[PDB]
Every structure is written in C-alpha cells, then in structure tokens.
C-alpha cells in the first residue's frame with residue numbers, strides 16, 4: 001500500500017508510486033527521475049498516464065519499453081494543466097532529467113515536491129520566487145550536520161588533475177570509472193576531455209546515455225573499448241579483483257589502472273579535505289573514493305528551507321525509524337526559530 005507521503009492531497013495525483021499496483025483514486029502518476037527506487041514497478045504493461053520530463057520520457061520508452069501513448073513529457077519552467085490542476089516542473093540539480101514539481105491546488109494551497117535534489121542558490125531565482133509555498137515534500141537524505149562535502153566543481157578539479165598527472169607520468173595507464181545508474185556523468189566526461197579520449201562502455205550503458213540530450217555526446221562516448229583510455233564499468237567491479245581481471249582483458253595495452261568510485265558521503269568527510277584524499281593501492285592498481293554528491297548537504301538544505309519558509313514540511317527520506325524522524329523534526333524547528341517564520 002502506498003504511503004501517505006507519496007500522495008498529493010486534493011488531487012488525483014501520486015509521486016514516485018509505481019510499486020503498489022493500481023492506487024485507489026490515482027488519475028495521474030508523476031515520476032521525478034529515472035532512479036530504480038523511484039521507478040520501481042514501471043514496464044511495457046503499464047497503462048496509466050505517466051507525467052515526467054522529456055529526458056525521463058526517453059528513458060521510460062527506450063529502457064523499460066513503456067508505450068508512447070501513456071508517456072506525457074512536460075517542458076520545464078512552463079505552467080501546464082494536468083487533469084484540471086496547474087503544475088510546473090523545475091530542474092532538481094540531481095541526475096539528468098530530474099525534476100521538482102510545483103502543484104497549485106484548486107483551493108489556493110501551493111505544494112512543492114522536491115523529488116531528489118541538490119539545493120542551490122540558483123533555485124531562489126526560478127518560478128519559486130513568485131509565490132508562497134504552504135507544504136514542502138523534502139528530500140532529507142543528508143539531514144544532519146555531520147554531512148558536509150565539497151562543491152561538485154572542487155571534486156571535478158581533483159579528479160581531472162589526478163588523472164592528467166597519472167597518465168602524463170605513465171602513458172600506458174588506463175583510467176576506470178564506476179557507475180550503476182544515471183547521474184554523475186561529469187566525472188567520466190571531464191576526465192576523458194582532459195586526456196583527449198572518448199569514454200568507452202558497454203552497449204547497454206551507451207544506450208542509456210544516448211537518451212539524455214547531452215550536447216555533442218556522439219563526440220564523447222563510444223562502444224569501441226580499444227580506441228578509448230577511459231573505461232566505464234559497473235560499480236561492483238571497482239575493487240582489486242575486478243580491476244585485475246579487466247586489465248587482463250586489455251591485451252597488454254596497459255600496465256596500470258587508476259580507478260574512481262564516486263560515492264555520496266562517507267565518514268572520511270568529517271576529518272579530511274578534498275585536497276588530502278588518497279587512494280587505496282595494491283600493486284599496479286589504485287582506487288580513489290571521491291565525494292561527488294547529487295543530494296543537498298545539510299547546510300545547502302537548511303539555506304533552501306530557511307529561504308522558502310514553508311508552513312509544513314513532509315520528509316520523503318529516512319522516514320522508517322522513530323529516531324530519524326525525531327532528529328529531522330528537531331532540525332526543522334531550529335531552522336524556523338532561527339529565521340523567524
């Protein structure tokens with residue numbers, strides 16, 4: 001059964017609610033982004049209207065074979081009417097195609113559903129600036145002050161400089177980047193750009209990236225592994241055994257691997273600066289964990305909410321334990337008292 005925090009009151013609508021069968025009274029199913037915990041349950045047999053971004057729509061049609069007649073793509077930053085209700089999709093600064101959804105209820109209530117997001121001051125000048133929001137359904141993934149991490153730009157600087165140094169010292173080194181979902185494409189595209197290479201990958205991953213409207217993509221990616229010195233591999237294979245095995249397959253073209261695992265937060269964040277990050281090394285293999293996040297830090301989240309001043313907050317992440325829920329509610333109250341709303 002569908003949990004309450006996936007239902008939008010006063011509407012026929014649900015958000016990211018595809019794993020519960022036919023939801024009673026739902027007339028339109030919104031999908032914020034193509035990540036499996038959110039799309040879980042969609043397939044070619046789905047016959048209700050799905051509302052989403054253009055990019056999410058390309059992925060539904062090509063990867064899950066959802067039929068075209070049930071895919072309803074909406075442009076961003078544009079007022080649209082869905083089953084009698086005005087909605088707007090906003091960029092979520094998450095993965096490609098990820099959106100936040102503004103609903104304008106017929107009684108005058110305005111609701112923002114963030115989906116998954118990385119809050120940014122640039123959001124304070126979107127169509128959110130133009131009216132009051134009463135209820136916020138908030139991505140609280142990292143809602144605790146221990147969660148600090150650098151900007152995406154600092155992380156990419158670290159990765160480009162690390163890769164360019166290693167390959168210039170040893171032109172026979174291979175760079176490998178882990179992946180298991182869409183998102184974080186900048187990691188492998190930035191590194192391939194500094195090295196003058198295309199990114200090589202499986203046919204299935206090439207297909208996925210071809211759905212993303214990224215400019216000049218035919219110029220940056222390929223299925224010909226032999227022509228490429230940046231390879232993408234499943235995240236599970238980014239370990240010493242998996243990488244040793246891959247190096248064997250390259251036919252003596254390379255004699256060293258430098259590999260990157262973009263994680264979210266890890267507790268090495270509480271002690272160490274990005275400058276000071278070091279790899280794990282075994283023989284001719286080194287592995288870097290880099291803290292490239294597509295979710296808000298605690299401070300980014302706090303800034304957004306204190307700017308928005310919602311009347312009520314409904315968390316959508318970490319809702320399963322009483323300790324988590326109590327912790328989150330304490331921070332929301334602090335934020336409200338400090339800012340004065």
Ligand code: NI
Pocket residue numbers: 033035094116
């Ligand atoms: Ni996500």
